[PDB]
């Protein structure tokens, strides 16, 4: 047989529901499981779907350079093959053989999908441009003035056409406003201003953090680019600590930080979460960097070429995409993805009303104190 070492991470390595009631390879399941199955089919052999000890992918010690993780196994003979989401690195390849990537990915972004924004106190103007509002106002006052100038400037054949054209105008205005507002309220399209990481670099309202220790953090510290360097500057000079200690921590933070946080992680885990519950997240933009999970094998082996060839065979056979759709989207729970009108949507209207009302009232008061004063005193 073969010593297959991997680690428990979904949807790659998952324990069957009745794992305690089972003893064998049937316990495990996921992506890499069927992957190793097809790999053995191609080559032909027996394999024991074991697990890593320290629950680590692979790294070394700065002082003892001891490989901890699957790397330590495939290097120290404890294992013969590692079919897991093992990231490919310069150092890890300098010691063993990495097959061609079976899963290309890259760092991505995770946020909470757009929720219904604040009522927008002055939102009833959103259907139209402020310029159109000012034009309506000035047209109203100009028409009133013209009417004033056909009574003193003349004793009608003028108020008729003026009234008619004003009727036409207000008609079309009412209709346009109603139609646009109905279109707004019917479909309810949602969008967030974050379609990339450049946007996050520009603004600073919503925050963003990373796992306090991981490849992503070092990459951000490194990668001296105008954008990523700026984001590292921010996350280094920013309070409170935007970083986290685990993944689910950042996920729950974004969930409770609905509109002011965003977590960066492997695009695979992001696409996975987005399909899991509570279906209240989303990935935006594209992969910042580009990495690849590929098979591993000790430096001197015999499956290197066979596995490297089977990987391309599957990538061309439309099989890796099949397994991915299975374990990410078909299995996905988020396969799916009117209300009344509150006062907050129209409060500005009543504010304007009260304003104009008090204004007319003060005008009348001063006009009275002038008219009566003049008529009495004179």
């Amino acid at each position: 047989t073969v010593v297959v070492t991997t680690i428990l991470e979904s949807p790659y390595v998952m324990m069957k529901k009745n794992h305690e009631m089972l003893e064998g390879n049937e316990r495990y399941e996921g992506y890499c499981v069927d992957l190793a199955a097809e790999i053995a089919k191609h080559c032909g052999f027996k394999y024991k779907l074991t697990i890593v000890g320290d629950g680590k992918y692979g790294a070394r010690d700065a002082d003892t350079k001891i490989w901890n993780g699957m790397v330590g196994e495939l290097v120290y003979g404890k294992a013969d093959i590692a079919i897991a989401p093992l990231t490919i690195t310069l150092v890890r390849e300098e010691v063993i053989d990495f097959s061609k990537p079976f899963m290309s990915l890259g760092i991505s972004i995770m946020i909470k999908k757009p929720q219904k924004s604040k009522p927008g106190v002055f939102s009833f103007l959103d259907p139209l441009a402020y310029e159109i509002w000012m034009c309506i106002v000035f047209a109203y006052i100009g028409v009133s003035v013209v009417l004033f100038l056909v009574s003193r400037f003349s004793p009608s054949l003028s108020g008729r056409i003026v009234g008619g054209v004003w009727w036409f105008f207000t008609l079309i205005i009412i209709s346009s406003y109603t139609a646009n507002l109905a279109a707004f309220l019917t479909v309810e399209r949602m969008v967030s201003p974050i379609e990339s990481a450049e946007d996050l670099s520009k603004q600073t309202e919503i925050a963003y953090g990373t796992l306090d220790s991981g490849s992503t953090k070092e990459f951000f510290r490194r990668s001296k680019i105008a954008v990523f360097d700026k984001m590292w500057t921010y996350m280094r000079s920013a309070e409170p600590s935007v970083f986290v200690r685990t993944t689910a921590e950042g996920v729950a933070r974004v969930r409770k930080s609905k509109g002011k946080y965003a977590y960066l992680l492997e695009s695979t885990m992001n696409e996975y979460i987005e399909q899991r519950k509570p279906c209240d997240t989303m990935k935006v933009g594209g992969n910042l960097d580009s990495k690849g999970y590929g098979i591993a094998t000790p430096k001197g082996s015999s499956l290197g070429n066979a596995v490297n060839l089977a990987v391309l065979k599957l990538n061309e056979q439309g099989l890796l995409d099949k397994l991915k759709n299975k374990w990410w989207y078909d299995k996905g729970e988020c396969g799916s993805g009117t209300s009344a009108l509150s006062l907050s949507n129209v409060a500005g209207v009543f504010y304007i009303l009260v304003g104009g009302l008090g204004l007319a009232m003060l005008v009348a008061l001063i006009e009275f104190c002038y008219k009566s004063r003049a008529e009495a005193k004179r």
């Binding site: 006062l343 907050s344 409060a347 009543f350 009260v354 009302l357 008090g358 009232m361 003060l362 009348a364 008061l365 009566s372 009495a376």
Partner: protein, 134 residues
């Protein structure tokens, strides 16, 4: 943070503006009448004009104060209404309750009423303030 009581309160203070204005105007009218109390024909015309204005400025008080009360009621508010009610009692009392001698009381009446309306303006603004943010 609207509650339907902020609109009522702001409208109420708006109206209280001219309420204070008319109270001060009535005070000034009573003062000039006290001073006063064909030059005789001129004084008669002036007092006729002022009394006409007064009699014209009676219904609005009733109207807007009843509006205050009814809107306070319709807003499930029950701490300010009870303060405007006594004024309504006095108003309805005025019918079957009510120059050279009557002004002596009308003076203090208008003074106390202006004080009440000013206090009510301040209280309504305070209510709208500490109710519009919550």
């Amino acid at each position: 943070a609207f509650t339907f009581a902020a609109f009522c309160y702001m409208l109420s203070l708006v109206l209280c503006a001219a309420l204070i204005f008319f109270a001060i105007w009535h005070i000034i009218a009573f003062d000039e009448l006290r001073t006063d109390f064909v030059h005789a024909r001129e004084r008669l015309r002036n007092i006729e004009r002022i009394c006409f204005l007064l009699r014209k400025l009676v219904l609005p008080e009733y109207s807007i104060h009843s509006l205050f009360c009814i809107m306070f009621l319709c807003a499930q508010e029950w701490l300010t209404l009870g303060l405007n009610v006594p004024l309504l009692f006095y108003h309805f009392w005025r019918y079957f309750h009510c120059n050279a001698d009557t002004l002596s009381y009308c003076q203090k009446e208008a003074w106390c009423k202006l004080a009440f309306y000013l206090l009510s303006f301040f209280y309504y603004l305070y209510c709208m303030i500490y109710t519009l943010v919550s």
